[PDB]
Amino acid sequence: EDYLTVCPFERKIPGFSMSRVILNPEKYPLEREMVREKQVEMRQVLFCKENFSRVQKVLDFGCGHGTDVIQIAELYPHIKTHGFTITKAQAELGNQRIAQKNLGARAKIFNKDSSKDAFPDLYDMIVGIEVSFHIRNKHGLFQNISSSLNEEGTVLLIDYIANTRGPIVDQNVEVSIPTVQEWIELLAEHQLVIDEIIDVSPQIANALHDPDVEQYIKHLPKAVQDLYINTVNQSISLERGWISYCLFKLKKAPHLTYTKRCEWNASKLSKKRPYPEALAEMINSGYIPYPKQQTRT
């Protein structure tokens, strides 16, 4: 019932330390509920143009603990959901939770590599939240995605864009972030175009404003210290402006020329929508199909 991503704060909260809350959740359960609400809110903005009544099949190509695989299937009993995660332990846990909720006939998670193992079905919606920057072989991945996307389908991503002339690559942590131009061409090469691109960089940086974090994590066990260092590094790069954290809504445009797909994508990326504007548009529409916020009693 948890999410392995950062989350957007509308403003900085003085004293709020994300590293304390994330790394010591038993000590900060209610603060962790605040975080969870923002994780839900961001996903609501990502999903809020989709018609789940039309969808029959969904894929999550880096599904974490399976939370979206599970929650979509629970909320929309007509849908079948598939997840891929390359981490065996995560796949084991997601399938155990699928079983415990008696969802096995409609939700299934596979311990597979989305850049190499062909997705097993054809999907109306393909979801990658904070997943492709962990994947070195981008063309393998987007070949896989495009080949498994129904003609009228949607791809929904939460991912990074590098605002530099060359891609941002950290070999030791297996992170690779394409530039603007590389994203334009990577998508266009696999028949995809940007329907909507939303920039959440300022809000994310607000949530990750943690002025003592570097000192704090040096007083934590090495193991604990090693897993959060990537979040620290991402926070720094967002603050510098080297990367942008964005929500992508993609469609297939197979009948458009490659050049026209490039020109479309470049135009969308030249005027990314601010998240507060997209969030306010969602609230004003009143249409919020997925996820739902948790409520007491």
Ligand SMILES: Nc1ncnc2c1ncn2[C@@H]1O[C@H](CSCC[C@H](N)C(=O)O)[C@@H](O)[C@H]1O
């Ligand atoms: N090549 C690959 N194939 C499949 N999954 C991969 C992958 N590389 C990274 N991942 C997965 O991508 C996820 C990144 S963390 C994001 C998890 C989930 N989308 C969430 O929102 O909470 C992890 O589950 C990791 O195992």
